[PDB]
Design a protein around this ligand. Structure first.
Ligand SMILES: O=C(O)c1ccc[n+]([C@@H]2O[C@H](COP(=O)([O-])O)[C@@H](O)[C@H]2O)c1
Ligand SMILES: O=C(O)c1ccc[n+]([C@@H]2O[C@H](COP(=O)([O-])O)[C@@H](O)[C@H]2O)c1
Ligand SMILES: Cc1ccc(O)cc1
Ligand SMILES: Cc1ccc(O)cc1
Lengths: 347, 347
């Protein structure tokens, strides 16, 4: 049950983190000079599914795919079928995330959580429905549906741990999905929709105002409760957003790290942490999305991405791009020599 | 001759860059959505030693090692011998750069351009002298010495191209070397020394004022000419700084990319571009050094690092950390599918 899942997320291991910190301070560099590699290495040390030390075994990027009824409100530039096309492309290795995952030695799990098309062979099927409801006139989904999906995705994710996955990245694919992401960001952070509605997949400037109105209308009609994340997800989110949330809950329950991606992933992360604050220490940022609301969303999570790529593709592409960074923190930790063995004293 | 070298640096290939741009726009993503991977891929395309396309073959990080007489002015926290110790450690694979280079599949070339110790077996010997002169009372070196070293290093670097190196990173090791780097930054950018003098290798706050005075004194006594970079290097730089400059000149002459590292590398880069503006399109930033003057130096090069790690180790560690990013630009370019093959039309 979802209650049990949330309850049983482990706290970070303070003991391992102290040990990690002392090890790092003794490595063959001025103390603190590797900056955020150090802090990342200590963060990792504290994640119980890594067994007391910064390590990366196998890597999996989970790409949650779905369509949105709010497409019909004119907020997306690409035809609805692009979501289905791209999910099929994911099975052939031709996408941005696939290419960047291959570079990182990561496997990509393409999950259909609600594409409005025929099922795609070879894609993992968790489809709730053929696209979510149009958040401009009503809820994306029932609370039952959002709860079931979270629990489904969380279990899938934590099962990957038995196969030797120690690091996750989340991603999505869904035309129009920057609209619910913005709605959620607005609702969790209390920022006005005009501050958090971006151009998404190259929406023209003339169409922005409509998107802002649509976000405002979705929030007015649904009255999402900002202190109930599952309410927020179910009312003005999407199946993809819920899925990504589910990945974060599952990784956290497993005591393991998840790399965020971009703007969509930030919205999901806001929900994750609202639902369960104990998720927060397992989340690792990757890059700083070029999407307008990014700064606000990231500030509410108190996160500073490592990568400033002006990237806005989604798919988990940024998450993939950062996996080498996580690996570098571990290599630093395990493979550097020590000050003491060169007789270099702390000054 | 150094005149011939500088003269014969090639301009970037506009034709290849246009072709690269059109290819990238047709890949299976919204145009522009990979942001700085795109721009990096096009920058690469234009470097003539890469043969018309973004590619990475073998990778080499060149770590220029030397000692500085200005050590005697109380501007560094670690004993002078640390430079020699660490260069020896570089031969054993135990250093930050070694570990990060191994992660990136890069080879590290440890070059002694003036360590004040006995020569270290296994280190490439280009030593100009046993440490440079104390920039507080006089020049670091003669102009002849700075010219000879540049030319030596440039040739070494471009020779690595015959062995299949297509990407370089620069680094250094030298106690006290953040003092001349600051002096050079102050002189090239016209910023007051107080704005560009950092804590280096954990210099305590009580000792900062002395370091600022020392930079001011070095500039007052030497009167470096900001419009003659070789003058600036020879008077208030260091053998390590000159060497790194030489790596940038050699890579540019070869038509090939070099990754910058941190603050030291920025100072060298300022010199490189002053000496030869045609170097600039070959330089690629890695990370944003935690050193105080970083922002100013980087602004004068109009550069925005990809990585915000709060890193201040040097050694070429950041340069190594970014090589996977360069590789990702190429993988994007070569391995993504195309919009047209999925019948997705530009909207
Ligand atoms: O992750 C990001 O920051 C990002 C920012 C803008 C757009 N996207 C991607 O483009 C999509 C949605 O844009 P739109 O305009 O349809 O809302 C979708 O499939 C994405 O993952 C992704
Ligand atoms: O690259 C950097 O940004 C960086 C910033 C601060 C210090 N360092 C390193 O620490 C060294 C110099 O610091 P200091 O205080 O002796 O001038 C030297 O060997 C470095 O490469 C390097
Ligand atoms: C003490 C020290 C260690 C490494 C290094 O790169 C510089 C200084
Ligand atoms: C057109 C497009 C392509 C890829 C993608 O991830 C989103 C939209």
């Amino acid at each position: 049950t979802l209650h049990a899942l949330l309850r049983d997320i482990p706290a970070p291991d303070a003991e391992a983190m102290a040990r990690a910190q002392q090890h790092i301070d003794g490595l063959l560099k001025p103390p603190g000079s590797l900056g955020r590699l150090e802090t990342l290495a200590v963060q990792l040390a504290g994640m119980p599914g890594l067994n007391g030390t910064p390590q990366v075994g196998e890597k999996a990027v989970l790409v949650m795919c779905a369509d949105h009824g709010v497409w019909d409100e004119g907020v997306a530039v690409y035809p609805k079928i692009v979501t289905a096309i791209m999910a099929a492309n994911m099975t052939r290795g031709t996408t941005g995330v696939c290419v960047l995952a291959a570079q990182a030695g990561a496997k990509v799990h393409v999950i259909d959580v609600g594409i409005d098309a025929e099922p795609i062979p070879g894609v993992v099927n968790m489809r709730v429905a053929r696209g979510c409801g149009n958040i401009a006139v009503g809820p994306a989904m029932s609370r039952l549906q959002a709860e079931a999906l979270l629990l489904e995705v969380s279990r899938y994710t934590c099962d990957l741990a038995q196969r030797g996955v120690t690091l996750f990245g989340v991603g999505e694919m869904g035309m129009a999905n920057t609209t619910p992401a913005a709605a959620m960001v607005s609702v969790f952070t209390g920022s006005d929709a005009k501050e958090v509605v971006g151009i998404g997949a190259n929406l023209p400037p003339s169409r922005i105002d409509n998107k802002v109105d649509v976000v405002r209308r979705a929030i007015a009609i649904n009255q999402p409760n900002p202190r109930d994340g599952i309410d927020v997800l179910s009312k003005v989110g999407g199946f993809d957003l819920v899925g990504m949330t589910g990945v974060m809950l599952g990784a956290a329950r497993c005591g393991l790290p998840v790399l965020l991606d971009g703007f969509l992933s930030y919205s999901a992360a806001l929900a994750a942490c609202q639902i369960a604050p104990a998720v927060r220490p397992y989340l690792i940022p990757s890059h700083f999305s070029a999407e307008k609301g990014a700064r606000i969303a990231l500030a509410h999570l108190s996160m500073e991405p490592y990568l400033h790529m002006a990237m806005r593709l989604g798919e988990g592409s940024g998450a993939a791009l950062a996996m080498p960074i996580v690996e570098a923190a571990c290599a630093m930790f395990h493979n550097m020599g020590e000050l003491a063995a060169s007789n270099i004293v702390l000054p």
